[PDB]
Design an enzyme around this catalytic site. Structure first.
Site, mmCIF file in Angstrom:
data_model
loop_
_atom_site.group_PDB
_atom_site.id
_atom_site.type_symbol
_atom_site.label_atom_id
_atom_site.label_comp_id
_atom_site.label_asym_id
_atom_site.label_seq_id
_atom_site.Cartn_x
_atom_site.Cartn_y
_atom_site.Cartn_z
ATOM 1 N N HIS A 32 10.849 129.335 27.863
ATOM 2 C CA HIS A 32 11.823 128.719 26.779
ATOM 3 C C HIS A 32 11.076 127.497 26.280
ATOM 4 O O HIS A 32 10.951 126.609 27.074
ATOM 5 C CB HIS A 32 13.102 128.744 27.199
ATOM 6 C CG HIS A 32 14.089 128.059 26.452
ATOM 7 N ND1 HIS A 32 14.665 126.714 26.909
ATOM 8 C CD2 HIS A 32 14.716 128.435 25.344
ATOM 9 C CE1 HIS A 32 15.320 126.153 25.918
ATOM 10 N NE2 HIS A 32 15.556 127.133 25.046
ATOM 11 N N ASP A 33 11.288 127.177 25.130
ATOM 12 C CA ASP A 33 10.743 125.867 24.492
ATOM 13 C C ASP A 33 9.475 125.510 25.225
ATOM 14 O O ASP A 33 9.363 124.303 26.039
ATOM 15 C CB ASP A 33 11.866 124.638 24.616
ATOM 16 C CG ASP A 33 12.720 124.874 23.548
ATOM 17 O OD1 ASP A 33 12.561 125.514 22.463
ATOM 18 O OD2 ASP A 33 13.825 124.358 23.553
ATOM 19 N N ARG A 69 7.965 126.558 18.673
ATOM 20 C CA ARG A 69 8.644 126.171 17.601
ATOM 21 C C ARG A 69 7.950 125.015 17.043
ATOM 22 O O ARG A 69 7.597 124.292 17.292
ATOM 23 C CB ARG A 69 9.938 125.254 18.296
ATOM 24 C CG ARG A 69 10.607 126.173 19.465
ATOM 25 C CD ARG A 69 11.163 127.310 18.598
ATOM 26 N NE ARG A 69 12.306 128.054 19.708
ATOM 27 C CZ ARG A 69 13.061 127.774 20.217
ATOM 28 N NH1 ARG A 69 13.660 126.362 19.400
ATOM 29 N NH2 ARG A 69 13.442 128.300 20.909
ATOM 30 N N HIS A 82 10.915 119.626 18.647
ATOM 31 C CA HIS A 82 12.009 120.010 19.440
ATOM 32 C C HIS A 82 13.116 119.780 18.598
ATOM 33 O O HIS A 82 13.338 118.465 18.634
ATOM 34 C CB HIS A 82 12.295 119.422 20.885
ATOM 35 C CG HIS A 82 13.579 119.859 21.408
ATOM 36 N ND1 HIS A 82 13.746 120.634 22.560
ATOM 37 C CD2 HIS A 82 14.663 119.836 21.044
ATOM 38 C CE1 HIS A 82 14.776 120.889 22.906
ATOM 39 N NE2 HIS A 82 15.621 120.526 21.970
ATOM 40 N N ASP A 274 13.722 128.450 31.732
ATOM 41 C CA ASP A 274 13.296 127.162 31.797
ATOM 42 C C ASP A 274 12.455 126.816 33.091
ATOM 43 O O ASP A 274 12.339 127.599 33.922
ATOM 44 C CB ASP A 274 14.401 126.155 31.639
ATOM 45 C CG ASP A 274 15.078 126.134 30.368
ATOM 46 O OD1 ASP A 274 14.380 126.552 29.414
ATOM 47 O OD2 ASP A 274 16.026 125.570 30.013
#
EC number: 4.6.1.13
Length: 296
Positions: A32-33, A69, A82, A274
């Protein structure tokens, strides 16, 4: 391939899996991210930071799905954001690491989810989609096939999960609805369906049951090759106070890693999480990969 010992090699886990298995059916660790690993400016950390090692450490740990992203700058390139703050990483930087990784281990494949994270810088020449597609997707590591993607087709390539709208070049997964903060289910291509659980910003308690509940639905609907299940085990809330994704991640990861170990399922879907590292107890990524023991 044929032996089960081959899922224990993180760098090459997808080698034993059969060439005809839709990527939907495979159980895949994801991050994630992914690009927040360079954020070390403290308050940025407690909010932005969701990983602590690089895309390659991530990949040598079995991750095959990356939550990317981006934002289009003046320089007419896509960078990693972010929210409104700039990670110190760029899209080119992701794509090359995926290439050297995939070159060292051509048996694997990687899925890159791209979403436009913030608004385009004022002097950008083109739109977000047209830019990504004219300057990057045109590269050929990008698998350009559509429909229910089998594994044979992707080894060596980067499969794209489109989280942006105005797209004109065919390839990977078509963009789909994705409502804010919930668990939903929609249709992707004519031939596919998706159940996504992405309740970030929710309490620990509700978070933990949304995961398991969605995990239960997949272990059961396991032989439905035409149905993707994405399970983000990440929870995001008010940082600065051990309410940071790390604090929750140090609970939710071992928690769920075990939930799969005891339940001995055949399929767990795509688990985006995460802090992929090696601190936590049973290792969520290893249990997810192992549940593929059933396809071998």
């Amino acid at each position: 391939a044929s032996s089960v010992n081959e899922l224990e090699n993180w760098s090459k886990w997808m080698q034993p899996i059969p060439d005809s298995i839709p990527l939907a059916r495979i159980s895949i660790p994801g991050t994630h991210d992914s690009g927040t690993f360079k954020l070390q400016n403290p308050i940025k950390q407690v909010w932005g930071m969701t990983q602590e090692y690089d895309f390659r450490y991530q990949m040598d740990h079995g991750a095959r799905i990356f939550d990317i992203r981006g934002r289009l700058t003046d320089d007419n390139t896509i960078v990693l954001h972010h929210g409104p703050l700039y990670l110190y990483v760029t899209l080119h930087e992701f794509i090359n690491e995926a290439k050297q990784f995939l070159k060292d281990n051509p048996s694997e494949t990687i899925i890159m989810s791209l979403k436009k994270e913030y608004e385009d810088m004022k002097g950008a020449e083109d739109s977000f989609s047209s830019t990504f597609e004219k300057k990057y997707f045109v590269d050929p590591i990008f698998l350009k096939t559509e429909g229910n993607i089998k594994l044979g087709d992707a080894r060596g390539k980067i499969v794209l999960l489109k989280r942006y709208s105005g797209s004109n070049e065919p390839g990977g997964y078509n963009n789909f609805y994705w409502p804010d903060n919930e668990t939903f289910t929609t249709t992707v291509n004519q031939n596919a369906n998706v159940t996504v659980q992405d309740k970030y910003k929710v309490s620990y308690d509700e978070k933990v049951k949304s995961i398991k509940d969605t995990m239960d639905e997949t272990m059961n609907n396991s032989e439905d090759l035409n149905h993707l299940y994405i399970n983000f085990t990440s929870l995001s809330s008010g940082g600065t106070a051990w309410n940071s994704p790390y604090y929750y991640a140090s609970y939710i990861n071992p928690e769920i890693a075990n939930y799969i170990k005891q339940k001995n399922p055949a399929r767990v879907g795509w688990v985006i999480q995460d802090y992929i590292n090696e601190k936590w107890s049973p290792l969520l990524y290893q249990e997810v990969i192992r549940a593929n023991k059933s396809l071998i």
